[PDB]
């Protein structure tokens, strides 16, 4: 026998999920773990140095990471980068230099995104002044710094436009940025106030439809941003809660805590009872399944202490993640069905993502 390298991941792309392990106890050795959701098999990994972030290219061909290096780790010159990795060989291909202000923080989806067309990576900066950085993937260059987004946070791509995204601002409204084919800002707009920052703060995680996004609040309200037009139209609140729910102080909690099943309009939200100030990141006691058309709950299931989730539209799946274990659910019907639990998928993960299958 002879040991060989150069191999590709053993399972098809459509089986793959990406568990971003912060490894917070040893945060300089964060990594992405690649699993087969159909059987729990570990498929490979991508090292991501200090507090890496990850996403898969919308065309499924590449893995993008964002990280920070120093010449001697804890001393020497800082290099913030995006790296492009081959998705099948799990090999490094290209480093893209960033200014030394990429967001260092927990793995919310909206800190490291891409345009719908896949041509631009859109990432959050904090120096601590905030701005949004644009990376041209084909050119391998940082091409734009959206200072218009100062005081805003996170990136919500618009799936109905090729190079448009929104960010949540300090006024409780949304800033929409439309990039040109060069990745520079081509136009922008600002919505009316959607939510009260002080009285009803929203979680940043969107329940994202093709032409609208829903957001849940600290107190269990729901807000929406409809971007079917060039101007975003905002509305809300409606409450996730009925009177019985209110009596037990049910509120949302988690990190990447919501999901939308686009075909049905069902929104999934992690919830826990005995809500009060300071419980917004508590593990799920339940997952609630909301019909966003009727604005009513249709189902509730045990939450398995989950903190983050993600949805695959075309296979009708939901993954949940409690920090270490990944639960796989069939959501083809209103009540989710638990298929399996992948134990020990990470030591400290707050983010799981499916390999994209929908193309660009």
């Amino acid at each position: 026998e002879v040991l060989t390298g150069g191999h590709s991941v053993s399972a098809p792309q459509e089986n793959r999920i990406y568990v971003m392990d912060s490894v917070f106890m040893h945060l300089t050795e964060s990594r992405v773990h690649v699993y087969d959701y159909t059987n729990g098999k570990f498929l490979g990994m991508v090292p991501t140095a200090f507090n890496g972030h990850v996403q898969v290219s919308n065309d499924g061909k590449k893995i993008y990471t964002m990280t920070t290096y120093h010449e001697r780790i804890t001393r020497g010159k800082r290099s913030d980068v995006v790296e492009v990795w081959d998705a099948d060989k799990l090999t490094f291909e290209k480093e893209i230099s960033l200014p030394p202000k990429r967001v260092q923080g927990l793995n919310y989806d909206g800190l490291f995104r891409q345009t719908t067309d896949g041509k631009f990576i859109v990432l959050q900066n904090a120096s601590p002044a905030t701005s949004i950085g644009i990376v041209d993937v084909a050119k391998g260059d940082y091409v734009e710094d959206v200072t218009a987004a100062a005081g805003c946070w996170s990136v919500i791509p618009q799936p109905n436009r090729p190079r448009s995204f929104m960010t949540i601002c300090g006024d409780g409204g949304l800033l929409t940025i439309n990039l040109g084919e060069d990745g520079k800002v081509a136009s922008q707009s600002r919505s009316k106030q959607m939510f009260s920052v002080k009285d009803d703060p929203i979680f940043i995680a969107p329940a994202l439809d093709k032409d609208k996004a829903h957001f849940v609040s600290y107190y269990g309200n729901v807000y929406s941003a409809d971007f079917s037009g060039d101007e975003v139209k905002v509305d809300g609140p409606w409450s996730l809660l009925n009177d019985e729910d209110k009596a037990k102080n049910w509120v949302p909690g988690g990190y990447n805590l919501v999901g939308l099943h686009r075909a049905s309009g069902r929104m999934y939200v992690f919830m826990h009872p005995d809500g009060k100030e300071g419980t917004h990141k508590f593990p799920a006691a339940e997952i609630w399944v909301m019909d966003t058309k009727t604005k009513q709950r249709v189902a509730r299931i045990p939450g398995r202490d989950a903190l983050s989730m993600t949805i695959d539209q075309q296979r009708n799946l939901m993954l949940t993640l409690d920090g270490g274990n990944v639960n796989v659910y069939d959501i083809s019907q209103p009540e989710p069905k638990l298929l399996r639990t992948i134990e020990g998928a990470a030591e400290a993960s707050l983010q799981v993502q499916f390999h994209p299958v929908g193309g660009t």
Partner: protein
């Protein structure tokens, strides 16, 4: 009041995530990492920036402004990890937010430990 002076308190009380002033701490308490509540462990550097907030002191009944400075430039302490979230808000209220590395602007941004510096009455 004694409740304002952690160096005079029992270390087990101060090193606990339920110590009153640690009310929005996401990370390892520096007082368990070879430092104290207000001194970085040897060879780690204070952050010039931080998240902030107020915490209620149940011992004197008053509310205090806290600055949650980090100590930076050494790898993760690993001890006394807390994730308290009282009055913590998302990144669109950035200085109230604790899911970011408040070592981000340090000469070396590696996160070592965090603490709770008493600024004054709220």
């Amino acid at each position: 009041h004694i409740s304002l002076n952690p160096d005079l308190a029992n270390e087990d009380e101060v090193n606990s995530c339920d110590y009153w002033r640690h009310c929005a701490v996401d990370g390892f308490l520096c007082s368990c990492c070879g430092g104290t509540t207000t001194t970085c462990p040897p060879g780690s550097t204070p952050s010039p920036i931080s998240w902030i907030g107020t915490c209620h002191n149940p011992h004197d009944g008053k509310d205090y402004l806290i600055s949650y400075h980090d100590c930076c430039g050494k790898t993760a302490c690993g001890r006394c990890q807390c994730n308290t979230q009282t009055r913590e808000r998302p990144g669109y209220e950035f200085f109230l937010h604790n899911d970011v590395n408040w070592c981000m602007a340090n000469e070396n941004s590696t996160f070592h430990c965090t603490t709770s510096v008493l600024v004054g009455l709220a």
